[PDB]
């Protein structure tokens, strides 16, 4: 169905006269396609997916120019924020920015994003109408006023509804063999005694794409959170994802428990029961 293009930027100051580190990564859905890192050798925007490598030198030259200009903006911003929060030059501080767009099944614009954080907390973000801002505090209110006066939201909106959507569609087309796939989870259950009266059941979902997935345990058909453990969804390293959920159960009562899996790749939710 739907799809997204997202760019993620991090800038970190270094004490005294050290230059800040700048990292930029871009994703289509859950697939990384470009990166820039100011510490890296190339000093250029680099491909991270096979399908973007078909873009010619004009693309890579333009993106490298732009990502360098992005890094210069964040460099200035680290300075501005140090003053706004009355902070010394001795410590390291972090700015993060995310922006992008979602499209629906018909590949038309669904929504746009532009969010900014300082030192790990929300600073300012574009609201969903793409015309107004939410500011976390007094410093961000200053930025809101400046961005209002300069009509920044209107400029972003043009990017998010126009350029972002068009290029996302181009990427979806050019990378069709790998971006337009869903990989349904391969599932199984494992069992381990944890004493002579309890056992662990672990329900596994492997090799899935995209990353969004829900695993839930039921006992006699009733939702069960007591004595369960769920890990964060994690990358396998080959473009797919992994997740597990586990429950500790009385020995001999394993069959009362079911694990339920929902994923865009499954035409129906799966139900698993300890089958050995």
């Amino acid at each position: 169905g739907s799809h997204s293009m997202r760019y993620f930027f991090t800038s970190v100051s270094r004490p005294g006269r050290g230059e800040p580190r700048f990292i930029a990564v871009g994703y289509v859905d859950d697939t990384q396609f470009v990166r820039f890192d100011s510490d890296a050798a190339s000093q250029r925007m680099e491909p991270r997916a096979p399908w973007i490598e078909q873009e010619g030198p004009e693309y890579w030259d333009g993106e490298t120019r732009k990502v360098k200009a992005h890094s210069q903006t964040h460099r200035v911003d680290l300075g501005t924020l140090r003053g706004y929060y009355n902070q010394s030059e001795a410590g390291s501080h972090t700015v993060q920015r995310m922006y992008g767009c979602d499209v629906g099944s018909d590949w038309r614009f669904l929504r746009g994003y532009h969010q900014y954080a300082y030192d790990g907390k929300d600073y300012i973000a574009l609201k969903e109408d793409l015309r107004s801002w939410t500011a976390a505090d007094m410093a961000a209110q200053t930025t809101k006023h400046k961005w209002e006066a300069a009509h920044v939201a209107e400029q972003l909106r043009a990017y998010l509804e126009g350029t972002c959507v068009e290029w996302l569609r181009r990427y979806l087309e050019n990378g069709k063999e790998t971006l337009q796939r869903t990989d349904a989870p391969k599932t199984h259950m494992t069992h381990h005694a944890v004493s002579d009266h309890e056992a662990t059941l672990r329900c596994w979902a492997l090799s899935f794409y995209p990353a969004e997935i829900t695993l839930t345990w039921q006992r006699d058909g009733e939702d069960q959170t007591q004595d369960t453990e769920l890990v964060e969804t994690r990358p396998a390293g080959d473009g797919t994802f992994q997740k597990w959920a586990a429950v500790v159960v009385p020995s001999g009562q394993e069959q009362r428990y079911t694990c339920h899996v929902q994923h865009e790749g499954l035409p129906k939710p799966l139900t698993l029961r300890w089958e050995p």
């Binding site: 760019y7 930029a24 871009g26 693309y59 333009g62 993106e63 732009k66 990502v67 200009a69 992005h70 903006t73 200035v76 911003d77 501005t80 924020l81 922006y99 900014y116 300012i124 930025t143 400046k146 961005w147 300069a150 920044v152 400029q155 972003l156 990017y159 350029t163 290029w167």
Partner: peptide
């Protein structure tokens, strides 16, 4: 593609 420019805070 990235945004063509960003405004300072």
């Amino acid at each position: 593609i990235l945004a063509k420019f960003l405004h300072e805070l």
